Amino acid sequence: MKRGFARPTPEKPPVIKPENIVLSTPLSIPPPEGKPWWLIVVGVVVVGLL
Amino acid sequence: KVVNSRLRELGEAPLEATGRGRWALCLVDGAPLRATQSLTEQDVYDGDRL
């Protein structure tokens, strides 16, 4: 002998929420801008020699 | 009788006691069941422990 059991309407399960995400594009390395170092080196010599 | 018979096949000593009293079925707290009523009258169903 067993106890009776009637199955009711199922309870609401917790809802799953999807997500579409697009990534951030990485930074770009700065190209090599360059100073004319030798010019100012000769400069301080000429003004000094005067 | 069947419990004592089965105990011997397992190699266990049969149920035995000394002194004035009697043998009966009890719940986990030691409370004995009613001697004159059906197991269907009491709250007993398949899989209970006694």
Asked if the C-beta of A5 comes within 8 angstroms of chain B's C-beta atoms, the answer is no
List of residues 6+ apart from B27 with CB closer than 8 A: B33, B50
Start-to-end Cα distance in chain A = 119
In the chain, the amino acid numbered A42 is V
Determination technique for this entry? cryo-EM
Resolution (A): 3.8
Instruction: From B22, B26, B19, select the one nearest B49 (Cα to Cα).
Output: B26
* 3-class state of residue A47 by DSSP: helix
| Spatial contact of B33 and B10, defined as CB atoms under 8 Å apart | no
Q: Which residues pair with B26 in a beta bridge?
A: B32
Contacts of A3 in chain B (CB under 8 A): 45
Judge: A3–B45 Cβ closer than 8 Å, yes or no.
Answer: yes
Supply B4's token pair. Answer: 């004592």
